[PDB]
Amino acid sequence: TNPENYHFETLQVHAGQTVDETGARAVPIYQTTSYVFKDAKQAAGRFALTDAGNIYTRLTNPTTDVVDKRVAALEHGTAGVTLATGSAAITAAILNIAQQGDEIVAANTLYGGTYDLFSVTLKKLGITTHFVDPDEPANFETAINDHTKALYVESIGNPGINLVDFEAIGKIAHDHGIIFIVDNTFGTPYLVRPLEHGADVVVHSATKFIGGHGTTMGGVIVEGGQFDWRASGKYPDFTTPDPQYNGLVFADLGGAAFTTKVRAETLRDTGATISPFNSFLLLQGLESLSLRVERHVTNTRKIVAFLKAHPKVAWINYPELEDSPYHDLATKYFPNGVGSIFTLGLTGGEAAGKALIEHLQLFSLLANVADAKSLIIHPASTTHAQLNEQELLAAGVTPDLIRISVGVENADDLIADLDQALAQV
Template identity: 50%
Template sequence: MSQYKFDTKMVHSGYQVEPTTKSVTPPLYLTNAYQFDDSQFAQELFELKQGGNIYTRLQNPTNDILEARVADLDGGVGALSFASGHAAIFNTMINLASEGDEVVASNAIYGGAINMLGVTLKRLGITVKFVDPDDLNAWEANISEKTRALFFEVVGNPNANVADIEAICKIGRRHGIPVIADSTFTTPYLCRPIEFGADFVIHSATKFLGGHSTVMGGIVVDSGNFVFKGNERFPLYNEPDQSYHGIVFADLGPTAFISRLRALITRDLGACLSPFNAFMLLQGIETLSLRMQRHCENADKVVAFLASNDSVSFINYPSLPDSPYKALADKYLPNGVGSVFTFGLKGGKETGRKFIDSLQLLKHVANVGDVRSLVIHPATTTHSQLSAEQLKAAGISEETVRLSIGLEDTEDIIADLDQAIKKAVK
């Protein structure tokens, strides 16, 4: 659907009317197995010589539609869905790195991801070096001959820092290292990292893509631009794979990464997305641009209210004139900077607690990207696994409160924030 624009693709990409039932909407295929044409066809499927459905752990027709749609929206050659955004990150990492390898990652990311990368991957023998995403020299300085990937969030969790996508991608390209951009907070509507050089894009579809706090899901999009063939950093792709009769994945060209991720990593670890969840995510994506526009509009108005409130000590929102990320936001996020950001109240931690406990409309939950407005205290919840040093490096203080602004009437959101602030600082 390359001739169509974004809003058309989000409704139609990946699906043609099913020939048997003529269903206009993508069907939900609740099946785990598929009948093979004959023995020879089955053998060729398992040898990756033939395309087709084998088992729903590897692919499913409903999931295929979701993957094709998100790949099209992001400008990639293919995508693969997972049971969660966390699974998408983990599977991507071990599709690139093995014991003894290294990854360089931003320290301004979701706390659970820092724990997974810094603790769980470490147990597997993969070392992750965390850097300040704004310090381009730090990215360069932490690259070694063992580095297999660079990883960052386009808009960081929780403080809404904006990564210099193009600059980081140039560093990766200079060293022959793929760059992974987590675009969960931005979605393809606000930013398409592949256009700025990213090799792979990750989404926690649980958030804005689904948009309604109903199902979990993760998606990895392959740009098809990273060349594994002949790259000495990646013997996994250039040496015959014993589990697939000696296939050399680098020989698959633009689809090498996504093919290996599906055929080998997902086959062995099994973190596949439920077809039902894929069906629900497709429903969410059909209204993605409309929701993201409203999310951004509402967030702008809420930020304006907070900026005028004398009880507010700081706001981390990248489109503010005095934000250190204003220029990057203008460059990478012309349609809006999203609706997840942080702020603080004068009075510190206890005032922040009182504020959260006084809210009536906003929901106190460990999620973002919902049609509902949400609130949480990162230091004691989403980023509580981090040490004091890690929290400081990520710019998270005891008074930091994270908001995810939803689609309610802005006057109601602001009224709830106002009454909660007054109670907290009284």
């Protein structure tokens, strides 16, 4: 994990970065695809996974490697692996422990994407996921069984902005001998470390917060390295020596089991590999993640207060709020804030929200979150237009719903902009 016990701010700046022979203080962009092997042994050794080193950029990259380590350090885990996007980090994570005919138990509150994947695409492939209501931790136990291999939820609903009892669902899963995978995109390691509250694997859509400016895509998978793969016995690929990899037992890697299996199977075969550039820009984003998340909260705090007190605001979801049905969860798991993404409904309903959008100057109309620039959009008509009233209202998406992602601009300017706009709907 973290060697000389460094604090978050130090880890987000140094984690997994070494200095090569050139003395280059910044991580070089290893925009290469292959690596020269010392001799014919090392070649066979690297491809056999028995000799530590670079192999192929689809599999390995000195730049991307620093991201794996660094994110893991922040997430306080044991090993990380990066991928083309968040969607791919999810697809890989799932496929690593779910075969055909098997199933997984995932929360009702999910990003339009994560959802339409679990339900339409990966099922089509014979892996259906049973959607439970995250508000009642026990609600998962009811759909669990023998074909179930992992309990999946999002650290903060998208757009349900609903918290969940991490520790509860973690045991409910371990009691049945399966792992807890938490999609921490919305919370980030600075706000919450699912791996330290009952989670085994944490996925991220670095595209959003880790990246920081809406310029780069990428996903990350971090493992806690705290789940006996043999014990539970429910994960064969992990137990049964791999013929294709020289009878290697993934469970023998320990803290690196889950991640070295994605890299050697899913990643190598499906190839949703990140480009060294993207990884570079992620390293820059991480070098300031905390600082930006800190402002993302204090800004959202101020913007939420002003919005709650405005007559023209019907309702406002935001766990930290003293009267949100999740306030208690917030205080227990999110001591530093609940993010900067929130939903709200206006008093003039649907036509009013879109109207507000059409008047704001500092809020951009687009599909994204966690940009340094503030954003707003109406989920139902976009990011979740892949779900019918059936799932739509099941994930909290109502015709009057409007979503906001608070940037790092000046709170006064954002409030002023919001004011002038509402003063016209």
